[PDB]
Short mmCIF file of C-alpha atoms and ligand atoms in Angstrom, two decimals:
data_model
loop_
_atom_site.label_atom_id
_atom_site.label_comp_id
_atom_site.label_asym_id
_atom_site.label_seq_id
_atom_site.Cartn_x
_atom_site.Cartn_y
_atom_site.Cartn_z
CA UNK A 1286 96.55 55.20 147.22
CA UNK A 1287 98.35 52.35 145.26
CA UNK A 1288 95.48 50.15 144.03
CA UNK A 1289 95.44 48.47 140.54
CA UNK A 1290 95.55 50.42 137.31
CA UNK A 1291 92.44 52.47 136.52
CA UNK A 1292 90.43 52.21 139.66
CA UNK A 1293 88.51 55.13 141.04
CA UNK A 1294 88.67 55.91 144.84
CA UNK A 1295 86.70 58.64 146.73
CA UNK A 1296 87.18 58.42 150.47
CA UNK A 1297 86.28 60.39 153.57
CA UNK A 1298 86.94 59.62 157.20
CA UNK A 1299 85.68 61.92 159.97
CA UNK A 1300 85.35 61.84 163.77
CA UNK A 1301 81.72 61.64 164.93
CA UNK A 1302 80.47 65.18 165.68
CA UNK A 1303 83.57 66.86 164.17
CA UNK A 1304 83.38 69.54 161.47
CA UNK A 1305 86.69 68.59 159.75
CA UNK A 1306 87.71 65.16 158.23
CA UNK A 1307 90.80 63.26 159.13
CA UNK A 1308 90.97 61.72 155.62
CA UNK A 1309 89.64 63.51 152.61
CA UNK A 1310 90.34 62.01 149.11
CA UNK A 1311 88.04 63.21 146.43
CA UNK A 1312 85.20 63.29 148.97
CA UNK A 1313 83.19 65.67 146.85
CA UNK A 1314 83.21 63.47 143.75
CA UNK A 1315 79.94 61.71 143.05
CA UNK A 1316 80.07 57.88 142.62
CA UNK A 1317 77.93 54.75 142.26
CA UNK A 1318 76.90 53.82 145.85
CA UNK A 1319 75.59 50.26 145.08
CA UNK A 1320 74.13 48.63 148.26
CA UNK A 1321 75.41 51.45 150.51
CA UNK A 1322 72.25 53.19 149.33
CA UNK A 1323 70.47 50.99 151.87
CA UNK A 1324 71.89 53.19 154.65
CA UNK A 1325 69.84 56.06 153.35
CA UNK A 1326 66.72 53.87 152.72
CA UNK A 1327 66.83 52.57 156.34
CA UNK A 1328 67.21 56.11 157.81
CA UNK A 1329 64.34 57.51 155.66
CA UNK A 1330 62.18 54.45 156.45
CA UNK A 1331 62.66 54.81 160.22
CA UNK A 1332 61.81 58.48 160.11
CA UNK A 1333 58.77 58.13 157.77
CA UNK A 1334 57.26 54.73 158.69
CA UNK A 1335 58.77 54.20 162.18
CA UNK A 1336 60.27 51.02 163.67
CA UNK A 1337 56.87 49.47 164.30
CA UNK A 1338 55.46 49.73 160.77
CA UNK A 1339 54.36 46.36 159.35
CA UNK A 1340 53.60 45.30 155.75
CA UNK A 1341 49.99 44.06 155.47
CA UNK A 1342 48.10 41.70 153.20
CA UNK A 1343 44.35 41.12 153.46
CA UNK A 1344 41.45 39.16 152.11
CA UNK A 1345 38.44 41.40 151.97
CA UNK A 1346 34.83 40.90 151.01
CA UNK A 1347 32.75 43.33 149.16
CA UNK A 1348 29.11 42.12 149.31
CA UNK A 1349 26.76 40.22 151.71
CA UNK A 1350 27.26 36.57 152.62
CA UNK A 1351 24.08 34.50 152.23
CA UNK A 1352 24.02 30.80 153.08
CA UNK A 1353 27.81 30.59 152.57
CA UNK A 1354 27.68 32.43 149.27
CA UNK A 1355 29.43 35.81 148.91
CA UNK A 1356 27.22 37.99 146.65
CA UNK A 1357 30.04 40.12 145.35
CA UNK A 1358 33.81 40.10 145.03
CA UNK A 1359 36.68 38.64 147.03
CA UNK A 1360 39.56 41.14 147.06
CA UNK A 1361 43.08 40.00 147.88
CA UNK A 1362 44.84 43.28 148.76
CA UNK A 1363 48.61 42.97 148.52
CA UNK A 1364 50.91 45.39 150.32
CA UNK A 1365 54.46 44.86 149.05
CA UNK A 1366 55.28 42.54 152.01
CA UNK A 1367 58.63 41.06 150.98
CA UNK A 1368 58.28 38.17 153.42
CA UNK A 1369 54.86 36.89 152.37
CA UNK A 1370 54.88 33.10 151.85
CA UNK A 1371 52.63 30.52 150.04
CA UNK A 1372 51.59 29.29 153.47
CA UNK A 1373 50.33 32.71 154.40
CA UNK A 1374 47.97 32.71 151.37
CA UNK A 1375 46.86 29.18 152.42
CA UNK A 1376 46.19 30.34 156.05
CA UNK A 1377 44.25 33.43 154.93
CA UNK A 1378 42.09 31.22 152.67
CA UNK A 1379 41.55 28.82 155.62
CA UNK A 1380 40.35 31.84 157.61
CA UNK A 1381 38.07 32.93 154.86
CA UNK A 1382 36.42 29.43 154.72
CA UNK A 1383 36.09 29.34 158.55
CA UNK A 1384 34.27 32.70 158.52
CA UNK A 1385 31.50 30.92 156.49
CA UNK A 1386 32.38 31.58 152.81
CA UNK A 1387 32.08 28.50 150.63
CA UNK A 1388 31.36 30.21 147.31
CA UNK A 1389 31.87 33.55 145.67
CA UNK A 1390 29.15 34.82 143.34
CA UNK A 1391 31.54 37.20 141.84
CA UNK A 1392 35.20 37.84 140.79
CA UNK A 1393 38.45 37.31 142.65
CA UNK A 1394 40.36 40.56 142.58
CA UNK A 1395 44.19 40.78 142.88
CA UNK A 1396 44.59 44.26 144.24
CA UNK A 1397 48.02 45.95 143.81
CA UNK A 1398 46.69 49.52 144.09
CA UNK A 1399 49.19 50.32 146.89
CA UNK A 1400 51.80 50.88 144.15
CA UNK A 1401 51.56 52.08 140.50
CA UNK A 1402 53.71 52.30 137.41
CA UNK A 1403 56.67 49.93 136.66
CA UNK A 1404 57.88 47.37 139.29
CA UNK A 1405 61.45 48.10 138.10
CA UNK A 1406 63.43 51.29 138.91
CA UNK A 1407 65.06 53.45 136.28
CA UNK A 1408 68.63 52.37 135.51
CA UNK A 1409 68.40 48.69 136.42
CA UNK A 1410 70.34 46.52 133.83
CA UNK A 1411 67.73 44.53 131.83
CA UNK A 1412 69.97 41.41 131.78
CA UNK A 1413 69.74 40.91 135.51
CA UNK A 1414 65.88 41.08 135.66
CA UNK A 1415 65.50 37.34 135.56
CA UNK A 1416 67.97 36.85 138.49
CA UNK A 1417 66.46 36.65 141.88
CA UNK A 1418 68.71 39.39 143.32
CA UNK A 1419 66.90 41.78 140.90
CA UNK A 1420 63.36 40.33 141.01
CA UNK A 1421 60.90 43.20 140.41
CA UNK A 1422 59.74 44.15 144.00
CA UNK A 1423 56.08 44.33 143.13
CA UNK A 1424 53.10 44.86 145.40
CA UNK A 1425 52.37 41.17 144.99
CA UNK A 1426 55.25 39.04 146.29
CA UNK A 1427 55.07 35.43 147.34
CA UNK A 1428 58.24 33.55 148.43
CA UNK A 1429 60.30 36.47 147.23
CA UNK A 1430 59.06 36.04 143.65
CA UNK A 1431 61.85 33.55 143.03
CA UNK A 1432 61.48 30.00 141.88
CA UNK A 1433 63.87 27.17 141.02
CA UNK A 1434 64.10 24.80 138.07
CA UNK A 1435 66.32 21.84 137.08
CA UNK A 1436 67.77 21.56 133.61
CA UNK A 1437 68.74 18.08 132.47
CA UNK A 1438 70.81 17.46 129.36
CA UNK A 1439 69.33 14.90 126.88
CA UNK A 1440 70.95 11.46 126.90
CA UNK A 1441 71.34 11.66 123.12
CA UNK A 1442 73.11 14.78 121.82
CA UNK A 1443 71.03 16.87 119.43
CA UNK A 1444 67.87 16.10 121.44
CA UNK A 1445 66.35 18.76 123.72
CA UNK A 1446 67.55 19.34 127.27
CA UNK A 1447 64.42 19.19 129.47
CA UNK A 1448 63.20 21.16 132.47
CA UNK A 1449 61.81 19.90 135.82
CA UNK A 1450 59.89 22.33 137.93
CA UNK A 1451 57.88 21.84 141.12
CA UNK A 1452 54.14 21.62 140.25
CA UNK A 1453 53.12 24.26 142.76
CA UNK A 1454 55.11 27.10 140.99
CA UNK A 1455 52.63 28.74 138.59
CA UNK A 1456 55.12 29.43 135.88
CA UNK A 1457 55.27 27.98 132.28
CA UNK A 1458 58.58 26.59 131.19
CA UNK A 1459 59.69 25.80 127.62
CA UNK A 1460 63.07 24.42 126.46
CA UNK A 1461 64.61 25.20 123.09
CA UNK A 1462 67.97 24.08 124.48
CA UNK A 1463 70.10 21.82 122.25
CA UNK A 1464 72.27 19.24 123.99
CA UNK A 1465 75.86 19.20 122.76
CA UNK A 1466 78.16 16.24 122.39
CA UNK A 1467 81.48 16.41 124.25
CA UNK A 1468 83.98 18.50 122.24
CA UNK A 1469 81.35 20.38 120.22
CA UNK A 1470 82.61 23.31 118.10
CA UNK A 1471 79.55 25.07 119.49
CA UNK A 1472 80.54 25.00 123.12
CA UNK A 1473 82.59 28.16 123.01
CA UNK A 1474 80.19 30.89 121.78
CA UNK A 1475 76.76 29.20 122.09
CA UNK A 1476 75.08 30.82 125.10
CA UNK A 1477 72.52 29.33 127.52
CA UNK A 1478 69.79 31.95 127.90
CA UNK A 1479 66.56 32.65 129.69
CA UNK A 1480 63.92 34.56 127.81
CA UNK A 1481 60.92 35.73 129.90
CA UNK A 1482 57.54 36.19 128.29
CA UNK A 1483 54.09 37.31 129.41
CA UNK A 1484 52.19 35.52 132.19
CA UNK A 1485 55.30 34.05 133.78
CA UNK A 1486 56.36 32.13 130.71
CA UNK A 1487 60.12 31.40 130.45
CA UNK A 1488 61.94 29.89 127.49
CA UNK A 1489 65.43 28.45 127.86
CA UNK A 1490 67.35 28.72 124.61
CA UNK A 1491 70.80 27.98 123.30
CA UNK A 1492 73.09 25.07 124.15
CA UNK A 1493 73.94 22.90 127.10
CA UNK A 1494 76.95 20.55 127.13
CA UNK A 1495 76.26 17.00 128.27
CA UNK A 1496 76.36 16.70 132.08
CA UNK A 1497 75.72 13.72 134.36
CA UNK A 1498 73.84 15.96 136.82
CA UNK A 1499 71.02 18.48 136.22
CA UNK A 1500 71.84 22.19 136.21
CA UNK A 1501 70.04 24.02 139.03
CA UNK A 1502 68.71 27.48 138.04
CA UNK A 1503 66.73 30.07 139.94
CA UNK A 1504 64.72 32.80 138.27
CA UNK A 1505 62.77 35.89 139.14
CA UNK A 1506 59.05 36.08 138.57
CA UNK A 1507 58.29 38.99 136.25
CA UNK A 1508 54.50 39.27 136.82
CA UNK A 1509 53.95 39.02 140.59
CA UNK A 1510 50.21 39.87 140.38
CA UNK A 1511 49.59 36.92 138.03
CA UNK A 1512 51.76 34.66 140.10
CA UNK A 1513 50.09 35.55 143.44
CA UNK A 1514 46.69 35.16 141.66
CA UNK A 1515 47.43 31.64 140.50
CA UNK A 1516 48.59 30.78 144.05
CA UNK A 1517 45.41 32.24 145.48
CA UNK A 1518 43.29 30.33 142.87
CA UNK A 1519 44.95 27.03 143.77
CA UNK A 1520 44.51 27.63 147.57
CA UNK A 1521 40.85 28.59 147.05
CA UNK A 1522 40.17 25.42 145.06
CA UNK A 1523 41.98 23.21 147.67
CA UNK A 1524 39.88 24.71 150.47
CA UNK A 1525 36.74 23.92 148.44
CA UNK A 1526 35.73 27.59 147.76
CA UNK A 1527 34.21 27.95 144.26
CA UNK A 1528 33.70 31.15 142.24
CA UNK A 1529 31.62 32.12 139.21
CA UNK A 1530 33.69 35.06 137.89
CA UNK A 1531 37.35 35.30 136.95
CA UNK A 1532 40.62 36.40 138.45
CA UNK A 1533 41.01 40.11 137.65
CA UNK A 1534 43.68 42.66 138.52
CA UNK A 1535 42.61 45.68 140.51
CA UNK A 1536 45.05 48.60 140.09
CA UNK A 1537 43.03 51.77 140.99
CA UNK A 1538 42.67 53.08 144.54
CA UNK A 1539 39.48 51.88 146.16
CA UNK A 1540 37.79 51.78 149.56
CA UNK A 1541 38.57 48.62 151.51
CA UNK A 1542 35.88 45.99 152.05
CA UNK A 1543 35.44 43.94 155.22
CA UNK A 1544 38.76 42.40 156.26
CA UNK A 1545 38.18 38.69 156.78
CA UNK A 1546 41.78 37.55 156.89
CA UNK A 1547 45.13 39.32 157.29
CA UNK A 1548 48.89 38.90 157.53
CA UNK A 1549 51.34 41.45 158.86
CA UNK A 1550 55.12 41.21 158.45
CA UNK A 1551 57.53 41.51 161.31
CA UNK A 1552 58.17 45.03 162.58
CA UNK A 1553 60.06 47.29 160.23
CA UNK A 1554 63.05 47.61 162.51
CA UNK A 1555 63.47 43.85 162.32
CA UNK A 1556 63.18 44.00 158.51
CA UNK A 1557 65.64 46.87 158.16
CA UNK A 1558 68.02 44.77 160.33
CA UNK A 1559 67.79 41.80 157.88
CA UNK A 1560 68.16 44.35 155.07
CA UNK A 1561 71.38 45.87 156.40
CA UNK A 1562 72.91 42.68 157.72
CA UNK A 1563 72.32 40.61 154.56
CA UNK A 1564 72.01 43.43 152.01
CA UNK A 1565 68.47 42.45 150.93
CA UNK A 1566 67.55 44.26 147.71
CA UNK A 1567 63.91 43.26 147.92
CA UNK A 1568 63.38 44.61 151.42
CA UNK A 1569 65.21 47.87 150.44
CA UNK A 1570 63.06 48.39 147.32
CA UNK A 1571 59.66 47.47 148.83
CA UNK A 1572 60.45 49.85 151.67
CA UNK A 1573 61.52 52.54 149.22
CA UNK A 1574 58.28 52.64 147.30
CA UNK A 1575 56.28 52.46 150.62
CA UNK A 1576 58.06 55.59 151.87
CA UNK A 1577 56.70 57.53 148.87
CA UNK A 1578 53.20 56.12 149.31
CA UNK A 1579 53.15 57.00 153.02
CA UNK A 1580 54.61 60.54 152.59
CA UNK A 1581 52.42 61.78 149.75
CA UNK A 1582 49.29 59.60 150.09
CA UNK A 1583 49.52 58.32 146.48
CA UNK A 1584 50.17 54.89 144.98
CA UNK A 1585 53.85 54.16 145.52
CA UNK A 1586 56.14 54.79 142.57
CA UNK A 1587 59.91 55.12 142.05
CA UNK A 1588 59.61 58.82 141.56
CA UNK A 1589 57.50 59.39 144.63
CA UNK A 1590 60.03 57.29 146.58
CA UNK A 1591 62.96 59.49 145.34
CA UNK A 1592 61.14 62.71 146.05
CA UNK A 1593 60.12 61.52 149.55
CA UNK A 1594 63.63 60.32 150.60
CA UNK A 1595 65.14 63.66 149.41
CA UNK A 1596 62.45 65.57 151.43
CA UNK A 1597 62.80 63.39 154.48
CA UNK A 1598 66.61 63.79 154.58
CA UNK A 1599 66.39 67.56 154.13
CA UNK A 1600 63.49 68.29 156.48
CA UNK A 1601 63.91 65.76 159.28
CA UNK A 1602 67.65 65.06 159.08
CA UNK A 1603 68.92 68.48 157.94
CA UNK A 1604 70.79 66.92 155.03
CA UNK A 1605 70.50 68.62 151.70
CA UNK A 1606 71.62 66.02 149.20
CA UNK A 1607 71.89 68.67 146.42
CA UNK A 1608 72.71 67.12 142.99
CA UNK A 1609 72.64 63.56 144.46
CA UNK A 1610 70.60 61.22 142.30
CA UNK A 1611 68.47 58.64 144.18
CA UNK A 1612 66.70 56.16 141.91
CA UNK A 1613 65.91 53.37 144.22
CA UNK A 1614 66.19 51.93 147.76
CA UNK A 1615 68.58 49.00 147.12
CA UNK A 1616 71.25 50.71 145.15
CA UNK A 1617 70.75 48.38 142.07
CA UNK A 1618 70.28 51.34 139.81
CA UNK A 1619 73.22 52.52 137.74
CA UNK A 1620 71.56 55.97 137.94
CA UNK A 1621 72.30 56.39 141.67
CA UNK A 1622 75.00 58.99 142.18
CA UNK A 1623 76.27 60.33 145.50
CA UNK A 1624 79.48 61.85 146.91
CA UNK A 1625 81.18 60.45 150.07
CA UNK A 1626 80.66 63.94 151.54
CA UNK A 1627 76.87 63.60 151.17
CA UNK A 1628 76.79 60.02 152.56
CA UNK A 1629 79.02 61.37 155.38
CA UNK A 1630 76.28 63.85 156.40
CA UNK A 1631 73.84 60.98 156.67
CA UNK A 1632 76.29 58.88 158.73
CA UNK A 1633 76.91 61.78 161.09
CA UNK A 1634 73.16 62.22 161.56
CA UNK A 1635 72.75 58.49 162.34
CA UNK A 1636 75.61 58.52 164.87
CA UNK A 1637 74.21 61.71 166.58
CA UNK A 1638 70.80 60.17 166.86
CA UNK A 1639 71.80 56.58 167.31
CA UNK A 1640 70.27 56.34 170.84
CA UNK A 1641 66.89 57.24 169.25
CA UNK A 1642 67.21 55.17 166.09
CA UNK A 1643 69.03 52.08 167.33
CA UNK A 1644 70.66 52.04 163.94
CA UNK A 1645 74.33 51.13 164.28
CA UNK A 1646 73.43 47.73 165.86
CA UNK A 1647 71.64 46.85 162.58
CA UNK A 1648 74.82 47.22 160.51
CA UNK A 1649 77.04 44.22 159.87
CA UNK A 1650 79.78 43.98 162.57
CA UNK A 1651 83.15 42.99 161.16
CA UNK A 1652 84.08 39.50 162.27
CA UNK A 1653 80.52 38.61 163.46
CA UNK A 1654 77.66 39.01 161.02
CA UNK A 1655 76.08 39.85 157.86
CA UNK A 1656 78.26 40.85 155.02
CA UNK A 1657 81.38 41.55 157.20
CA UNK A 1658 81.73 38.20 159.02
CA UNK A 1659 85.02 37.72 157.18
CA UNK A 1660 86.29 40.61 155.23
CA UNK A 1661 89.95 39.84 154.82
CA UNK A 1662 91.19 43.44 154.83
CA UNK A 1663 89.23 44.29 157.91
CA UNK A 1664 90.26 41.10 159.65
CA UNK A 1665 93.92 41.72 158.79
CA UNK A 1666 93.73 45.34 159.99
CA UNK A 1667 92.96 44.03 163.44
CA UNK A 1668 89.58 45.73 163.36
CA UNK A 1669 87.16 42.83 163.81
CA UNK A 1670 84.46 44.00 166.33
CA UNK A 1671 85.50 47.61 165.72
CA UNK A 1672 83.76 48.30 162.38
CA UNK A 1673 80.01 48.42 161.73
CA UNK A 1674 79.47 49.11 158.08
CA UNK A 1675 77.33 48.59 155.03
CA UNK A 1676 78.93 47.08 151.88
CA UNK A 1677 78.17 48.05 148.27
CA UNK A 1678 79.23 45.12 146.11
CA UNK A 1679 79.30 44.17 142.37
CA UNK A 1680 81.91 43.48 139.66
CA UNK A 1681 84.88 45.81 140.36
CA UNK A 1682 83.07 47.69 143.11
CA UNK A 1683 84.13 47.53 146.73
CA UNK A 1684 82.18 50.19 148.63
CA UNK A 1685 82.00 50.48 152.37
CA UNK A 1686 80.08 53.08 154.50
CA UNK A 1687 79.71 53.12 158.30
CA UNK A 1688 81.61 53.46 161.58
CA UNK A 1689 84.88 52.44 163.12
CA UNK A 1690 85.93 52.58 166.78
CA UNK A 1691 89.56 53.48 166.93
CA UNK A 1692 92.45 52.49 169.23
CA UNK A 1693 91.86 55.63 171.36
CA UNK A 1694 88.13 54.76 171.51
CA UNK A 1695 87.16 57.63 169.15
CA UNK A 1696 84.25 56.69 166.83
CA UNK A 1697 84.73 57.78 163.21
CA UNK A 1698 82.37 57.68 160.32
CA UNK A 1699 83.77 56.70 156.94
CA UNK A 1700 82.82 56.28 153.29
CA UNK A 1701 84.95 54.30 150.86
CA UNK A 1702 83.64 54.46 147.27
CA UNK A 1703 85.99 52.30 145.17
CA UNK A 1704 85.13 51.19 141.63
CA UNK A 1705 86.85 50.08 138.40
CA UNK A 1706 88.69 47.43 140.41
CA UNK A 1707 88.37 45.75 137.03
CA UNK A 1708 90.90 43.13 135.95
CA UNK A 1709 92.11 41.89 132.54
CA UNK A 1710 90.22 38.74 131.31
CA UNK A 1711 93.21 36.53 132.27
CA UNK A 1712 92.94 37.40 135.97
CA UNK A 1713 89.18 38.02 136.44
CA UNK A 1714 88.60 35.36 139.06
CA UNK A 1715 91.58 36.34 141.29
CA UNK A 1716 91.06 40.06 142.08
CA UNK A 1717 91.92 40.30 145.84
CA UNK A 1718 95.60 40.95 146.86
CA UNK A 1719 95.71 44.82 146.27
CA UNK A 1720 92.21 45.45 147.81
CA UNK A 1721 93.04 43.38 150.95
CA UNK A 1722 96.46 44.99 151.32
CA UNK A 1723 94.80 48.37 150.77
CA UNK A 1724 91.96 47.86 153.27
CA UNK A 1725 94.39 46.18 155.79
CA UNK A 1726 96.68 49.18 155.77
CA UNK A 1727 93.87 51.76 155.57
CA UNK A 1728 91.71 50.57 158.40
CA UNK A 1729 94.85 49.64 160.38
CA UNK A 1730 96.06 53.22 159.79
CA UNK A 1731 92.68 54.70 160.74
CA UNK A 1732 92.41 52.42 163.70
CA UNK A 1733 95.97 52.92 165.11
CA UNK A 1734 96.54 56.58 164.18
CA UNK A 1735 93.19 57.93 165.57
C1 AIX B 2693 74.39 45.72 146.83
O1 AIX B 2693 75.48 46.21 146.44
C2 AIX B 2693 73.78 44.43 146.23
N1 AIX B 2693 74.60 43.99 145.09
C3 AIX B 2693 73.94 43.52 144.01
O2 AIX B 2693 72.76 43.41 143.88
C4 AIX B 2693 74.92 43.06 142.89
N2 AIX B 2693 74.15 43.22 141.68
C5 AIX B 2693 75.29 41.62 143.03
C6 AIX B 2693 76.62 41.27 143.43
C7 AIX B 2693 76.98 39.97 143.52
C8 AIX B 2693 76.05 38.98 143.29
C9 AIX B 2693 74.76 39.29 142.90
C10 AIX B 2693 74.37 40.59 142.79
C11 AIX B 2693 73.73 43.28 147.33
N3 AIX B 2693 75.02 43.04 148.02
C12 AIX B 2693 75.54 41.78 147.54
C13 AIX B 2693 76.58 41.26 148.56
O3 AIX B 2693 76.41 41.70 149.69
O4 AIX B 2693 77.41 40.43 148.17
C14 AIX B 2693 74.40 40.68 147.40
C15 AIX B 2693 74.78 39.56 146.43
C16 AIX B 2693 73.90 40.11 148.76
S1 AIX B 2693 73.11 41.73 146.65
#
């Protein structure tokens, strides 16, 4: 129990298939799940979409092709594939050319109709939206909608710091950054900021102290449709395909044209494995809106995703999540709220159906992979290779949800929702001892005593 001052612990530990818990500490109390939400996303995804689902992107033609000229529109139909790469667009364009299209007497349509409404879930902090871990998981993703930039201080203080960016990234960078002399009075409270604008404009503002080396930065693309469009436009031009119209967005549901090129992701089981092992927000959130699209046959939205996951858990898994709030697939949202006792029902379902789902093998294994390769507390408890669990991690939050095989060989499911492991400013970069000692004793206890 003895953690630092002010932290909030809800904890439940329960033998697989048992009706009573071994440990029950505030298990009914709802908490922020953070990335442990991905356990629920993966279960709902496997039930709704199946392990063999693949994300799809196509180039389609609407119109007849006469002497190499398409009389009509080229449609690039995006499908929320989180693994789509620039190369993939290049290869699809190569295929289009090879099929005999040299020219489009028409428009080039960037079709995102698979999804609708905002590409950002309710409850996501605005300030993180330009960080790649929170890049809007839109229908149109290329290279994870994340790009990098180099910021160089100016040789002469007072002059503008300047930005280098690879020419192939269709973004527009502006610097309003003032370079500060060493010892400037401004260093303390002058911030270095990124301000996103329309059409993938970014302005860097504020101050940068002199440095000998450039500062590397990575940012999230805010308008994936425009970004993918510019990549497509560039690849069309390089392949020698001309067009008379313009690049337009297509957002309304429409009958497919003739598929001339396509790309499918790896199978969903493989993607869910990456997601659980590495805690991939983008895979979780593209999956989440896909679940709603599939279940209700409507463009995927956050609301449809939430409704669908609740229905799938109740109807296929027998889990009534009650007053649980599910806002997204990744757990980014500060709106997500769930009790250890509700997550426990999910974990029990997974364990009972694990031979069907092949689910537990996707979770990080303590001491081997993903997020638990070295978790000090688990290592020190002597439980490496005995815990398969999903982390939920952000400032002051140390959640864990999954399974442990005990000294007697009994498998137990557990949920540790721990937050407010906040520290005073003067110790903010050190916060470890109590957690590690707590986890070491706890999982040692659970392991040895069960
Ligand atoms: C799940 O809890 C996710 N956490 C976040 O997105 C946090 N906003 C965050 C924490 C630290 C750094 C950047 C973002 C995922 N789990 C994290 C983890 O496993 O450490 C993550 C960084 C891979 S994102």
